[PDB]
Amino acid sequence: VGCEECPMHCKGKNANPTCDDGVCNCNV
């Protein structure tokens, strides 16, 4: 719910945008 940090991390070769709600990660 208080998202922002979780998807940022991914940026390590490939991945990036939004958070996808509570849950979050890489995936594209």
HEC per residue, the chain: CCCCCCCHHHCCCCCCCCCCCCCCCCCC
The total of structural domains in the chain comes to: 1
Q: Which of 8, 12, 14, 13 is nearest to 25 (CA)?
A: 8
In Å, what is the CA distance from 3 to each residue of 11, 13, 20, 26? 16, 22, 9, 14
Per DSSP (E only), the strands in 1-28 are: none
Method: NMR
Parent domain of 3: 1-28
